[PDB]
Design a protein around this ligand. Structure first.
Ligand SMILES: [Cl-]
Length: 424
């Protein structure tokens, strides 16, 4: 056969029990959806004993636009004539950047973590299901407690330069019932409910309630103005969806950012709120039933990069990962606390453990906290038998990732990559 550089999908596993890293053979990304384009997985969602992801279309690679004399090139006027761009937006001559098919969304359903033989399904009711901010892809596919998978799209593609690459669909939601292999008839237009606004990203809270980080103005590539929260009850209003803005958070013009991953327990969501700059980050409790927020634990640091729990034998604690950023340096501290609802935490005591910053953080149940970092090594933490934060024995070298999640006993990370493939 003929080997060439093509777009692939990388999959990396961190097995939390064995403490072993494995690299899956690279998956072909070219023509993943049958239109020549390659994809970036957004989300590794465990539900119904299966993995759901949104394969986000990327446009055409250099290989894909040249393939069989431009078979896949629908809009040749968009193929780049020379190298250019900057950062994640950088492109090579011959690429077609961004999808040519913005008015649809796909979901891949995999039977297990081997990522073989996906069930690929398409809807024309929403655009693609992820959020975006510069180089980041945010998961927007989530399961209700009953296993129903809700597939949200903020319609990020509305901000594309070329008309044919804009979506004309409003931000909205569709559904895959638990155990089903295709979408049902559910559809909710979120812009009609929100006052014309989309969202940066979203998460599950409990039951059929989801948390949306809402925009105050237009969606944009820098995340500007993503300073409100709303609670979406998917089956509310007679299975039409119901959206309520959250009351009790700081005023939007006082919010610098929210932390990236809420912590959900006891039916509520705990969210890190970073105010504009004495004004410290604090963790707010959001009750989805009343769409009300209350101020809890104050964090005496720059930011909040993880909230969760660690447990070992008869010891357990909450763990807040906090950043300390100076003019000349970045630091991260893991801070133990018995409560998220009052008081404060401050680096500088025995209940704190310093780490390098990490690209992303994820808790595996209440057993481990993983600090995912590419080059830099990936590390993991636990409670020791004495109840203190401890580093696990094994470290890992992983590559750049754009999505991550847990299935079974594996932490899984993924990215679109260049790789050699053999064609017939
Ligand atoms: Cl439910």
């Amino acid at each position: 056969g003929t080997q060439s550089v093509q777009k692939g999908i990388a999959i990396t596993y961190l097995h939390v029990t064995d403490q072993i890293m494995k690299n899956r053979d690279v998956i072909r990304g070219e023509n993943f959806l049958g239109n020549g384009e390659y994809v970036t997985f957004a989300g590794i969602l465990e539900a119904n004993n299966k993995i759901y992801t949104a394969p986000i279309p990327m446009g055409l690679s250099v290989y894909g636009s040249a393939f069989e004399d431009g078979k896949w090139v629908k809009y040749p006027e968009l193929v780049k004539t020379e190298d250019g761009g900057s950062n994640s937006s950088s492109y090579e001559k011959g690429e077609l950047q961004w999808t040519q098919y913005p008015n649809e969304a796909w979901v891949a359903i995999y039977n297990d973590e081997n990522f073989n033989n996906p069930t690929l399904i398409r809807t024309d009711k929403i655009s693609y299901a992820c959020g975006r901010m510069r180089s980041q892809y945010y998961q927007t596919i989530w399961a209700a407690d009953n296993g129903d998978v809700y597939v949200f799209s903020p319609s990020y593609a509305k901000i594309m330069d070329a008309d044919v690459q804009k979506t004309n669909l409003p931000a909205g939601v569709v559904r895959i019932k638990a155990g089903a292999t295709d979408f049902d008839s559910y559809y909710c237009n979120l812009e009609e409910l929100s006052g014309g606004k989309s969202f940066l990203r979203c998460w599950h809270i409990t039951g059929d309630y989801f948390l949306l980080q809402m925009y105050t103005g237009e969606i944009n590539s820098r995340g500007t103005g993503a300073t409100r929260m709303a609670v979406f009850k998917a089956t509310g209003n007679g299975d039409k969806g119901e959206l309520y803005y959250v009351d009790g958070l700081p005023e939007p013009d006082r919010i610098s950012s929210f932390s990236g991953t809420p912590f959900c327990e006891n039916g509520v969501a705990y969210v890190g709120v970073i105010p504009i700059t004495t004004n410290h980050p604090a963790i707010y409790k959001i009750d989805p039933v009343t769409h009300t927020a209350t101020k809890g634990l104050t964090v005496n640091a720059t930011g909040i990069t993880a909230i969760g729990r660690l447990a070992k034998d008869s010891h357990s604690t909450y763990v807040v990962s906090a950043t300390v950023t100076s003019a000349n340096s970045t630091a991260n501290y893991l801070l133990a606390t018995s409560t998220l609802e009052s008081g404060s935490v401050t680096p500088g005591n025995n209940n704190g453990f310093e780490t390098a910053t990490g690209t992303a953080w994820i808790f595996y149940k209440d057993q481990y906290l993983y600090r995912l970092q590419y080059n830099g090594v990936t590390t993991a933490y636990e409670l020791n038998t004495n109840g203190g934060i401890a580093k696990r024995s094994n470290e890992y070298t992983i590559t750049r990732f754009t999505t991550y999640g847990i299935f079974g006993e594996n932490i899984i990370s993924s990215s679109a990559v260049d790789a050699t493939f053999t064609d017939l």
